[PDB]
Amino acid sequence: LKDRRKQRGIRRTAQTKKKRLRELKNYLKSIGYNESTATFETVYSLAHKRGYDYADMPEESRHRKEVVKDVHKAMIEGRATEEQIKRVERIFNKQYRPKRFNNRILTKCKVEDNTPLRKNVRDLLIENIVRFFPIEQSEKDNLKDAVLDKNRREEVKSFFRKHKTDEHIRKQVYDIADNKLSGRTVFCKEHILERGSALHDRNPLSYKKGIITRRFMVTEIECGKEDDVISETYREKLKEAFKRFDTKKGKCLTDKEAKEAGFCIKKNELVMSLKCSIKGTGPGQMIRINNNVFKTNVHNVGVDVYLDEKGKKKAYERKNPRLSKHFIEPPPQPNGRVSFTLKRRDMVTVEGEDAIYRIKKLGTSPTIEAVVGSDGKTRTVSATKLTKA
RNA sequence: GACGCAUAAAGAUGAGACGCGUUACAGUUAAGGCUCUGAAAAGAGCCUUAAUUGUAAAACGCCUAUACAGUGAAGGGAUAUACGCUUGGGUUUGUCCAGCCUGAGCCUCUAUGCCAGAAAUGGCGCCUUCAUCGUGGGUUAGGACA
DNA sequence: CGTTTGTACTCCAGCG
DNA sequence: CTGGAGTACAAACG
DNA sequence: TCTCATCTTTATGCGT
């Protein structure tokens, strides 16, 4: 669930960024900085990289103080007033989704009929310790009051030197009194002492004039796969770079090897990225959502076998209903009427054979395994010759 | 031994951000190629590759306008609010979940931030209503039986 | 003899 | 890892 | 990468 959490975080971060840009745009247009002005362009471009602020910046990505200093420069040269600068800076520092962590995960008492955080019941946790000391109850209460009061620590040290308590007990007392007690207690206050689901791939591909391609950095192009590089000059340069540093097969050059091979360096000090042809894909796996073209591995949901007016079987792949509007290529246009439908992992048999197979990968001629007696080998049979068991 | 407490390490789950990468469109720069013009140097157009700048997209969908957000005013602010309790709802489907979001009523449990102040306290964040201005918001890349 | 299914083989997938 | 993709060669239906 | 919160398991003590 870690990767789904990361995708969810990327999605929500982008949504928050759309929220921040809209509010800034509305406010700047409300002042008089319409989108043609230089102040709108500068302040709006700075909002795409508003910086971090989780750590403090020393005295006089980027930190948010650097970004806000640039925003201050942009608005002062744009003749803005201090209230408008303050409101724009308020938009830069605004929190759009509420960060809620104080009371989220709750623990229930183990007794047969919510438990507090440990940091809120330090008195009870100290009372759990000092209740077993041999001294009287008035001294127990005085010790409990002295431990929790941060000024009376010397009295506690005097008590422990007097009564010769164990070092681990003194340790426990000071960690209950002082430390940041993360978590909740086992008991309440009355009882302390008593495969996959992704429709498409994450990186969009470029699909122009029938050619599927994408950009990869020079340090991401494996040695045996150099021929996918579209640029002739950089393909031969990368071939000579692989020949120079004795990369046999598999993984690529490192950062230092790529820089020493003479490749250009980008402004963020990464290596240049090359346009490469994408293998292992086809035009039938291409979907377009907004501007982006993606590969989908869930493009087929089943196989439909049709009987025409001549009584002859023909197989057509049933495409995914969730993606049918987004396929670039036209859908199947079957003649006649449907006879039967073959889903993935259905058990089938082959015309003229007695063995029982099951569909591993599907299509017009789906790929079938033997259920019993398969050595891991498979074979493809036309779906017109199959029938469901 | 069991249980509780404290410490430490590792892992998991949820939340919120900062960046890199990818893609689409537009601009700029460099290198190369093709074509036209010219007495020639070279001028111009198109294409490719790389770098660079800006803007936009990153589930499909479903639900929500009886919603969501901004601004201003007024009132409340521990005798309070909700991340809590009780009971519903959206995602949600063929059925059931998780996770997240959320309505109404409520304060038994749980939680309650930032700043100035030794402190009482105050001011913001927060809650409600009204006015005004807009069109926005939640959840979806995870499971189980079908 | 000319299409048309059918093996053999190789390649594909976001991350600090 | 699944659930495909393309390509080369080939053996089989019409 | 960073921040915030909780949970589980494994030790090592202490207490009943």
> After which residues does chain A have a break in its backbone, defined as C to next N over 2.5 Å?
60, 113, 194
Inter-CA distances, A73 with A42, A46, A88, A90, A232, Å: 10, 12, 12, 16, 46
d(CA A173, CA A118) in angstroms, rounded, equals 13
User: A238 has which bridge partners?
Assistant: none
Are the C-beta atoms of residues A159 and A169 closer than 8 Å to each other?
no
Give the nearest nucleotide to A181, CA to C1'.
Answer: B6
| Protein side of the strand E interface (CB < 7 A) | A 54-55, 101-102, 104-105, 107, 117, 119, 132, 166, 168-169, 172, 180, 182-184
Q: Where are the domains of chain A?
A: 2-93, 101-194, 206-281, 296-388
Structure token digits, residue A53: 């602020």
User: A216 has which bridge partners?
Assistant: A274
Inter-CA distances, A316 with A262, A282, A341, A349, Å: 52, 17, 10, 19
Q: How far is CA A354 from the centre of its chain?
A: 48
Inter-CA distances, A376 with A23, A239, A342, A372, Å: 58, 37, 21, 11
Nearest CA to A141 out of A149, A156, A130 is that of A130
Distance in Å from B33's C1' to A165's CA comes to 89
Taking each continuous run of H as one helix and of E as one strand, the counts in chain A are 10, 13
Are the C-beta atoms of residues A277 and A213 closer than 8 Å to each other?
yes
Nearest CA to A302 out of A319, A323, A285 is that of A319
**How many CA atoms lie within 13 Å of A360's alpha carbon, on the beta-carbon side?**
13
Q: How was this structure determined?
A: cryo-EM
End-to-end CA distance of chain A, in Å?
Answer: 36
Q: Which residues contact A167 (CB under 8 A, 6 or more apart)?
A: none
User: A208 has which bridge partners?
Assistant: A211
Distance in Å from B134's C1' to A23's CA comes to 11
d(CA A272, CA A284) in angstroms, rounded, equals 31
Helices (H), A281-347: none
Nearest CA to A147 out of A132, A157, A136, A137 is that of A157
Strands of A156-268, DSSP E: 206-208, 211-217
Query: For A235, phi and psi rounded to 5 degrees?
Result: -65, -45
**How many CA atoms lie within 13 Å of A364's alpha carbon, on the beta-carbon side?**
7
